[PDB]
């Protein structure tokens with residue numbers, strides 16, 4: 001029968017910090033992680049800025065010899081996973097290693113590595129493709145390499161659901177534990193799509209903000225002057241654990257994961273429906289899963305991408321699901337500060353939702369100078385809002401009309 | 413408790429055929445789908461052959477205009493998915509669309525699209541990258557496009573576990589139905605990695621057979637002269653359905669999906685442990701999941717990739733799990749004929765496992781001319797073997813030591 005699932009460890013790389021606490025301090029201070037990209041010449045690109053991880057030292061985690069064969073998305077996913085496992089205080093033994101698994105996903109995986117091996121193929125030939133190219137680039141190898149480093153022999157998989165990846169990864173890892181397939185899962189996502197193909201590919205869809213002359217103001221969810229999402233890099237990992245397992249070992253419990261929803265829009269390859277119908281179905285699934293009155297929801301970490309159609313669809317979905325209570329909860333987009341970490345967005349935002357519960361504060365939506373038509377909820381404009389939060393919801397939406405919602409609550 | 417899951421529809425593209433019955437006819441006749449790769453200068457490559465899909469007409473499924481937006485691996489996944497849904501007779505309605513979902517995956521995704529967009533980027537700059545580059549290349553677009561075309565609003569996701577993808581996709585879709593999150597799922601995988609990057613990538617790791625003079629003899633699982641896997645393309649999709657739902661509409665039921673196992677080796681990146689300890693745990697997990705004793709297994713569709721280390725690990729795992737029954741079961745690698753479809757391998761091999769149950773026949777392991785040291789099981793060398801089959805296992809093992817097993821049983 002279905003077991004309860006709690007969060008006992010968290011790990012992060014984001015454009016605001018090389019761990020959770022440093023990232024969270026930036027979130028609560030309303031700091032932007034967005035800046036002109038230094039790692040490549042983007043003069044031919046319509047977008048030349050994003051959320052870079054700054055000063056990442058992979059030799060805090062792995063040998064340079066190993067790190068050199070891994071795409072950055074694997075490096076970031078391992079760093080976040082190592083932090084989460086250490087934060088959990090969990091000891092991996094012969095007695096429990098078969099009951100600990102990992103589900104770390106990515107939207108795009110090792111695009112930098114694929115682009116560099118494509119350059120080798122086209123400028124030289126197949127003889128110059130790295131032997132390490134495939135296992136160093138493909139999405140399942142955060143789960144793979146983490147399991148080899150820590151000796152995790154439980155369920156070992158990866159989701160790829162575009163911008164919903166991190167939320168689905170955490171939800172489905174919780175279902176694994178709920179249903180008895182595991183007692184512990186490391187779950188979340190990682191992304192590093194800031195290469196020529198990533199910036200040029202989102203650029204070709206005209207999906208990205210082009211505010212090159214003011215990058216910190218580019219990401220402006222629900223603002224009338226928003227012009228698309230800001231591409232960001234990083235990772236979030238959470239240790240999910242069966243409640244009685246966590247209680248038995250005296251674990252510090254951050255929060256309980258009480259609800260998970262998935263729904264497909266079945267609307268459009270890339271555009272969300274304006275009325276937010278799929279997001280509304282997804283949130284209702286999640287609230288019914290959690291056995292909640294919708295009025296119990298105090299805080300929503302929105303998807304909040306800073307796209308014209310996405311941001312307004314979310315307002316419509318929240319009004320539809322919550323009715324008059326839509327005016328009492330607080331909803332914010334931390335993408336205002338981090339930008340859009342794509343497959344890692346739902347992982348870092350799940351962490352921000354748990355910390356909103358720990359610290360009783362709604363992170364701000366920075367840059368919300370002029371809320372657009374109908375964006376008249378409490379969107380925590382400009383400054384963090386201390387408040388009562390018993391229940392926090394984290395939403396993600398992605399290409400393919402793929403939706404996820406996570407419901408977290410305080411554990412006493 | 414848990415609901416029962418049955419297979420009511422199947423669909424396939426493989427090196428043997430453009431549908432299930434044509435593919436299965438090749439399988440039972442011992443025919444190879446392997447040939448020199450055409451319309452591609454492989455002069456500089458150490459492998460010049462593989463399993464191509466021959467004569468695929470995407471316009472049976474999509475308009476030319478919608479097909480131009482999608483990588484071949486998405487086209488192949490949609491073809492298998494449309495076939496499977498047609499084969500099931502399912503009628504999607506407003507009353508059931510929220511109960512019908514998709515989990516179609518891929519191991520490597522849109523390499524061909526990436527390669528073609530790399531050409532444009534390097535030669536002409538980012539302004540020649542296609543606007544549909546991202547949504548036409550990412551792995552979750554089979555689930556995305558399928559849900560949009562058929563109006564499916566149930567769970568919408570995509571797994572990517574390298575060579576285990578199709579097995580895990582089907583298993584976790586089966587969990588969705590068993591635990592009441594959906595009544596119907598379309599599940600499986602698709603792959604088209606026959607580009608420079610895929611042949612070059614696996615070639616650089618020396619993972620591929622280089623038997624260019626005799627491509628049809630290259631894939632020779634458990635043969636002492638095997639020299640690596642054969643890269644192949646295609647797709648498999650199954651309609652998974654809750655039993656009472658299938659019975660109420662008078663569905664034709666092929667077989668029951670009774671067990672699903674997952675494990676991690678937590679051992680090696682590529683070469684599994686010689687004793688197949690991980691594959692043994694995974695198979696035991698699948699049988700415990702089905703409430704079956706190892707003695708009840710009749711037929712195993714091996715992973716059987718034709719790699720020195722892989723093939724021998726599976727012999728050890730089977731001897732370990734099955735003890736004095738290990739010789740009584742029949743175990744064959746249909747990769748001897750199809751080659752290795754990577755993320756679609758588990759999907760097409762679940763279909764061959766189902767059809768072994770329907771037709772009471774173990775497919776051959778062709779090219780098994782000289783069984784290697786210790787390869788003394790009933791590996792169905794050379795010719796199909798009619799026999800009693802009540803219970804059929806299908807195994808997949810992938811990069812990162814990620815394992816999957818499905819258990820299928822006759823239904824009547």
Ligand SMILES: O=C(c1ccc2c(c1)OCO2)N1CCCCCC1
Pocket residue numbers: 065066069070131132133135136145148149680681
């Ligand atoms: O250092 C490596 C390694 C080897 C080859 C690789 C790679 C990493 O990434 C892509 O190609 N390993 C392999 C097993 C994982 C634990 C450390 C040892």
